[PDB]
Point group: C7
Chain length 187, copies 7
C-alpha cells in the first residue's frame, strides 16, 4: 500500500534517526537488510545508540542469530522496542538489546519457545540433523538465560511449549526492562 | 499503476497535510507504514493534530494493537475519520481517536466482534492457544470499554457475534463523536453535523 | 498499464484540470485513490467544480459509499460524466453529481440493481449477515430515491433485478440531467 | 521490458504528433487511455486533425462505444488508419473516422459481426440479459449503418456471421475511404 | 533486470543509429512498437536508410503484415538483417527489405511455411473461418512471390510444410541478397 | 531487488569497461542484449578489444549462433572468459573468441555435446524436423572443428554424448588458450 | 519490503565502502552480481582490502566455484565474514578468504559436505554424469584441503555426511582464523576475540 515519501522514503527517514525496523517473519533476506543497516549505522558512529523497532512473529533460527550476533558485536548501545508482538526469534532480539534499554508498548505481546524443524533421509542423516537442532536449542537456551538472567532450568521449563507473556510478565521474566506508559488522552 | 501526481504522489501529498490513511486489511506491513508515519508527524510537531482516514474490514489483532498503542503513545491529538467502513480492528482504531475528534461520514458502517483464530497440535498446545486467544478477547474488550465508556457487560454482550452499526448508532455507543455532512460551509465557523 | 507521460502522466495531467477518473471495478483500493484526489482538489479550491469521469461496471458497496459520501461532503460542485457505462455503484456515483451537472455521452448505458453478497456460518450468523445486507439495500434505495427524486416504491420495483437504461431513459428516471449531443 | 525511450517514451513522442494508438483488445483501461489522449489533443487544438492508428481484434462493446462517442464528441477531424487488422469494435472505430479520412494499409483486414456474450442464472435474469444484448446489437447496427451509409437491411445481413473484408472490399462497403500503399 | 543503460537504455541508443530490433515472437505488441520506431525514424529523416535486425521464430500473421505494410509505406530505404533466425512471418519481413539491402549472417537459418490456426463453432462458422485462413495463405504466398520472384507453384510447394533454408539457400530462393561474414 | 548501483547498474558499469556478461541460459532475449552491447562497443571503438565473461549452461542453438556470428562479424578482438561453466552453446562462444585470447578460471568446467530437441506431427513433419536438427548438428560440428582445429572425426566422436572437460582438457582440445589462476 | 535508500540503496552504500554481501542461496544469478562487484572494487583499487559478508545455506556448485576463482584471481586481499551460517558452498567461500582474514561471529554455524545431484537417461549417460559428479567431489575436496591445511583423508572423512561446526570448531579445522566478539573497542588497537 506502497510507500511514503516525504520529503526520502519513510523508512529511509527513520534510518536517518538511527532507527532500524525489524518487521514480519525473519529470514535471510530480512536479516541481511537489518544487518546491512546496523553495520551502516555503526559506520556513521560507533558510539551513538541505535534503535530497533520490532514487530515479528519469529523466523529462521540462523537468520535470527545473525541479527543477534551483529547487535552484540557492534559497539553501539542498542535500544529495542516491542511494537505489536515479538514472538520466537523476535523476542530473542528484543531481549538482546542493551540492558536497561529494552522497551515495549503496553499492548504488545511476547512469546518464547524451543526451536522447531525437520529431518529426513537415511537414519545416519536423521541422527546428524537431530543432533544439530539439539545444539541449536541449547544454544538458544543459553542466550536467553544470559539476557534474562534466568537459570537454564527456568528457561528450559518456560520454552518447552509456546509461552505467551504480557509486557509486564516479560519485564518480570527478564526479556525487557520497560513497559512504556501511555500519556493522558487529551480529552 | 494506480497512484497520481500532484506536485510526491497523491498519498505522500496528503501526508504533508498530516493525513494518514489506514485502508484495506490490517497486517504487519500496514501497521509498520502507519506507525512510521505517525512517529514522523509527531516529530514535525507534537502539537498539530493528526488525521487518520479509516476504511478497513479489519485485520491482524497484534498489528492493530501496534497501531493503537502508537496512537495512544504519541502526544498529538488524533482525529479519526470513518469512510466506507471500520470493521473489527478498524473500529478499534476509530474509537481510539482523541475524545471529541472521532468522526464518520453519514453512510459509513461500523462493526465490532470478538476475535477469531485457529489452533492445531497436541491437546496441550491447543489448550495454550485457547488461553492466549481468550486473553486477546479480554484485552480487546477492555480497550473498547475504555474508549466507548460502556461497561464490560455491555461490550461482552455486543461483541459475542458480529455487531454492525450505523454512524449514529456508533456515536450513541461511544465509538464515534460526530457524523459530518460537510466541513465548515461558506460563512460558517463549525462543520455541519448529522442531527439526532 | 495505463499511463502516457506528458508534459506528469496523462491521468495526472487531467487531475491538473480537476478531473478524477473512476475506471473499472470499484473496490477499497480505487475508492482510496478517488477520495485522495477529491480531497486534494478541495484543498486546492473548495469552490471550483470538480469533474468525475465515470466508466465502471460497479464494485464493492461500502467502497462505493465511501466515494459517494466524499462527493457529498466536500463543498465543491461535482460534475459527473458517464463514458461507456455506469453500472451498479457506478450509476449511483453518476447520479450523485450536483443536480444539473450529471452528463452522459449518447451511446453509454446505465444499470441499477439491488446489492448481492454472501452469508455463511451458523443460522445466527447468517441471520446477522442477512439483516446487514437488507440494511445496505434500503440505504442504497434511499440514496437513489433522493438523487433521482423517485418514490421508494419506484426504486424498489426498478432495482429488484438488473435494470439497464439508455442515456435518455436514465435522464427521464432522474439518474442524470444531460444527454450530450454530438457535433455535426 | 518493452518500451523505447526517446528524445519520455516512443508512444508519448507520437502523441506530440497528435497520433493516438489503438492496439490490442479493447477494454475499459484501453478506452480510458485512448479517451484521455483524445481530450488532451482537443484542448491542445480543436482544429488540427488527430490520427488514430488501429490494430485491434476488437474487445468490450461498452468500452468501444466509449471511444466512439468520444471520437464523435470532439470537434477535431479524425483520420483513422487500419494497420494489421480492425476486427469487430476495432472496425466500428475505423468507420467512425471523419468522412474522407478513413484509411487502410494494403494488407490489413477488416471484420464486422453482431455482438456475442453470455448469461446464466434464473430465467428472469437470462431474459433480461438477452433483451440487453439485443439492444446492443441494434445499437451497433445503426451506427454501422450511419457511417457506412448502408441500409439497415444490408448491415443486418452482413453481420449475422463473421464477415471479413480486404481493404478494397471495406472501401466499397463504406467502412473506409482510401487504401494507401505509399505517402 | 536485463537492460544496460547508456549513455539511455541500450536499445534506445541503437534507435539513435536508425536501428530497429525485431526480437522474439511477433504479435500486436511487438508490431506496434516496431511500427512506432519505423515511423519515428521516418520523421527525423525520410531519406536515411533504416536498419532492421531480425531474430524471430515468427508470430501472428496480421501483426506481421502490419509491420510489412509500414515497411513498404515509409519512403526510407530498409536494410534487413537475419540474425540467428528469421522463421515464418520473420522471414517475410526479411524478404520485404529494399532490394539489394537484405542481409544474413553466415550461420542464421530461414524458415517459411503456410499459416496455421483454428476453426470452431457451427459448420457455417467453420467454413467462414476456413475461407478466411485460406485467403491469408494466398495473400502471404503472393507477398513472398513478389519479393522472391518465385512462381506461385514454387512457393506453394515450398510452404506446404516447414521449409528450412541456409543463408545461401535463402539468397538463391530470393529471400535475401547478401550473406556477410565481415562488414 | 538483486541490483547494486554505483557510480550505474553494476553491469552498465562493467560495460563502460567494454565488458559483456553472458549469464544464464542462452535464448533470444539474452542474445539480443549481448549483440546490442557488442554492436555498441564496436561503435565506441572498432580497435579496442572486448571482454566477454561467460557463465552459462548453454541454451537455444539459433540464439547462440546469433551471438557467434556477431562476434565474428565485428572487427574488435574478443577475449572470452569461462567463469563457473561454459556448457553446450556456451562452450561454443568461449571457443569463438579471438585466437590466443580465450581464457578460463582454474575451476570452471566446459561441456560440449550434439544438439537435442523435439518433434511431433505427421511422419512427413517428423522427417523434416529430423533433417533440420541433423543439419544443425553438422553446422555446429564444423564450427567447433574450425575454432578448435580438430578434425570432424574427432569432433563427431567427442560430441556424440555429453563431454565434460576441465579447463586444461579444454585447452588441450582447442576450446581455449589459457587457464588463469591469477593475471599474467 | 524493499530496500531503504540512504544517502542510495543500503547495499550500494556498503559497496561504496568496499563491502560485498553474499546472502541466501548461491546460483548463477547471485554469482554474477558478486563477481561483478568484486571486479568493480578491483578497478577502484587493486590494493585496498575487500570485505565479503557471508550468510548462505549454499547453492549451485559451478556458481560457487565462479565466485571462488574470482576471489583468488583478483589481486586485493579478501576478508571473509560469516554471520548466521556458511553452509556447503558458503563455507567454501568463507575458507577461501585471505589467510588471517577469515572471520565469524560467535553464533554462526558452518557446515561442509560432499556435493549432491541427479543422473538420468541411458546407462551410458548415467555413467557420464556419475563420473562428472565424482570429479566435482574431488575438486571440492582439494579446494578445502588447500585452504584448511587438512589432509585429503581428513577432508574426505569429514565431508562424507553433513558436518556442522561451531565457529571455534571451524577455526580449529582451518575454515576460518578469528571468532570476533567486538571490533577494536574504545582505547584498544585490536578487535576482541573469542
Ligand atoms: C526460538 S525458536 C525460533 C524459530 C521460529 N519459531 C517460530 O516462529 C521458527 O520459525
Ligand atoms: C475484536 S477484533 C478481532 C480482530 C478482527 N476480526 C476479524 O475481522 C480483525 O480485524
Ligand atoms: C446495489 S449496488 C451493489 C453493488 C454493485 N453490484 C454489482 O454489480 C457493484 O457495483
Ligand atoms: C458487434 S461487435 C461485439 C464486440 C466484439 N466481439 C467479439 O469479437 C469485440 O470486439
Ligand atoms: C505463412 S506464415 C504464418 C505465420 C507463422 N506461422 C506459424 O509459425 C508465424 O509467424
Ligand atoms: C549442440 S549444443 C545445443 C544447445 C544445447 N542443448 C542441450 O543441452 C543447450 O544448451
Ligand atoms: C561440497 S559443496 C556441494 C554443493 C552444495 N550442497 C548442498 O548443500 C550446495 O549448496
Amino acid at each position: 500500500p506502497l510507500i511514503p515519501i516525504v520529503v526520502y522514503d519513510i523508512y529511509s527517514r527513520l534510518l536517518r534517526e538511527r532507527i532500524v525496523c525489524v518487521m514480519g517473519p525473519i529470514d535471510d533476506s530480512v536479516a541481511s537488510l537489518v544487518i546491512a543497516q546496523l553495520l551502516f549505522l555503526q559506520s556513521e558512529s560507533n558510539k551513538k545508540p541505535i534503535h530497533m523497532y520490532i514487530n515479528s512473529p519469529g523466523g529462521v533460527v540462523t537468520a535470527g542469530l545473525a541479527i543477534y550476533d551483529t547487535m552484540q558485536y557492534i559497539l553501539n548501545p542498542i535500544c529495542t522496542w516491542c511494537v505489536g508482538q515479538a514472538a520466537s526469534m523476535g523476542s530473542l532480539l528484543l531481549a538482546a538489546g542493551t540492558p536497561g534499554m529494552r522497551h515495549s508498548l503496553p499492548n504488545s505481546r511476547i512469546m518464547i519457545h524451543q526451536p522447531s524443524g525437520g529431518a529426513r533421509g537415511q537414519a545416519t542423516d536423521i541422527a546428524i540433523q537431530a543432533e544439530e537442532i539439539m545444539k541449536l536449542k541449547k544454544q538458544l537456551y543459553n542466550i536467553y538465560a544470559k539476557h534474562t538472567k534466568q537459570s537454564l532450568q527456568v528457561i528450559e521449563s518456560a520454552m518447552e511449549r509456546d509461552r505467551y507473556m504480557s509486557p509486564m510478565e516479560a519485564q518480570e521474566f527478564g526479556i525487557l526492562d520497560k513497559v512504556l506508559v501511555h500519556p493522558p488522552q487529551d480529552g
